[PDB]
A paper describes a structure:
Amongst the factors involved in this maturation step, [name] is unusual, as it both interacts with ribosomal protein [name] and harbors adenylate kinase activity, a function not usually associated with ribonucleoprotein assembly. [name] forms a complex with [name] that is conserved between humans, yeast, and archea. These results suggest that [name] chaperones [name] assembly into pre-40S particles via RNA mimicry in an ATP-dependent manner.
Phasing was performed by single anomalous diffraction on the ADP/Mg2+ crystal form with platinum-derived crystals diffracting to 4.0 Å (see phasing and refinement statistics in Table 1). The structures obtained for [name]–[name] in complex with ADP and ATP show subtle conformational differences. Both nucleotides bind in the [name] ATP binding pocket. In the [name]–[name] structure, the C-terminal residues of [name] ([name]-CE) after the final β5 strand forms an unusual interaction with [name] that occludes the putative AMP binding site. Surprisingly, the surface of [name] involved in rRNA binding corresponds closely to the interaction surface with [name] in the [name]–[name] complex.
Author numbering:
A (entry chain D): 1 to 39, 49 to 60, 66 to 179
B (entry chain F): 12 to 129
The structure:
């Protein structure tokens, strides 16, 4: 079983994927490292090279030929706070917060794959989240999408958005 | 001769029209598909986008805005890259409601940091 863990930068892909590999007893693989060590990166090339029981970590993981995609979501304010913590520029932060707001990755994943499970991480510990994913795979559910609408929180993410004229 | 900026976002679930002043600091109007339609399933509809935009435009006109420049966020898939009719429908609804349309710029956000494609 090949599971992609994808979502906006800062959403918790790495945290959740590592914990998931541990709890399911699968192997954890970070996509960046993999791409570098197998030699800008070409997506077709990467897709060949990926192609075990693997939790695959990256925001490009949904463009790879996996068995299941897990799209992690988070309130775009959380994305903003985390990307400020990383030291991203104001514009890069705004761009990513907006990407989360408009479901950019989700839209990509549903376009690429049939089995897409969307998970809202908001106000959850990594443990609660991994157990949620597990309960779903075990259920087993192949597809769940359309479970967050961040337009509903729009006023709260305004300070992070690229609004200046 | 007061001009604003219409920020238009088309998402998987909804459409947002946020009109600000020229600086972007002052909010003139903020409307979503979810504010104008009763049913969750109609929130993504381009008809909902059109009605939301109509309300935003009417508010902006009442507040003295003559025209809007547009900044559009319209994400589309990686395989087929299709934004859908919604963002453009909202723009058209802004025009028909009586706003002049200024510069139109596509700011559709690209999530990045990690691997960087070419
Ligand atoms: N469920 C969670 N609860 C609290 N903090 C989290 C959670 N998931 C991730 N984090 C924190 O958010 C930050 C970004 O997580 P990370 O896994 O690097 O995101 P990504 O891999 O999506 O870029 C990390 O410092 C991590 O400790
Ligand atoms: Mg990570």
């Amino acid at each position: 079983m090949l599971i992609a863990i994808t979502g906006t930068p800062g959403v918790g892909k790495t945290t959740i994927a590592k914990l998931l590999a541990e709890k399911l007893g699968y192997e954890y693989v970070n996509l960046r490292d993999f791409a570098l060590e197998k030699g800008e990166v070409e997506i077709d090339e990467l897709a060949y090279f990926v192609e075990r029981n693997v939790v695959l970590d990256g925001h490009l993981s949904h463009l790879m030929p996996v068995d299941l995609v897990v799209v992690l979501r988070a309130h775009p304010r959380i994305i903003g706070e985390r990307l400020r913590e990383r030291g991203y520029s104001k514009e890069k932060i705004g761009e990513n917060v907006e990407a989360e707001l408009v479901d950019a990755i989700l839209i990509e994943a549903i376009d690429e794959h049939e089995n897409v499970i969307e998970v809202d991480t908001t106000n959850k510990t990594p443990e609660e989240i991994v157990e949620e994913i597990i309960g779903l795979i075990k259920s087993g559910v192949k597809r769940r999408v359309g479970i967050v609408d961040w337009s509903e929180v729009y006023d709260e993410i305004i300070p992070y958005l690229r609004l200046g004229g | 001769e007061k001009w604003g900026i219409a920020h238009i976002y088309s998402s998987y679930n909804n459409t947002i029209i946020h009109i600000t002043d020229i600086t972007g600091a002052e909010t003139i109007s903020r409307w979503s598909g979810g504010m104008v339609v009763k049913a969750d399933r109609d929130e993504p509809s381009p008809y909902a986008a059109m009605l939301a935009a109509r309300r935003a435009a009417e508010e902006a006109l009442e507040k003295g805005i003559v025209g809007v420049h547009i900044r559009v966020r319209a994400p589309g898939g990686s395989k087929s890259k299709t934004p859908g009719p919604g963002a453009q429908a909202a723009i058209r609804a802004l025009a028909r409601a009586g706003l002049k349309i200024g510069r139109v710029e596509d700011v559709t956000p690209i999530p990045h940091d990690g691997t960087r494609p070419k």
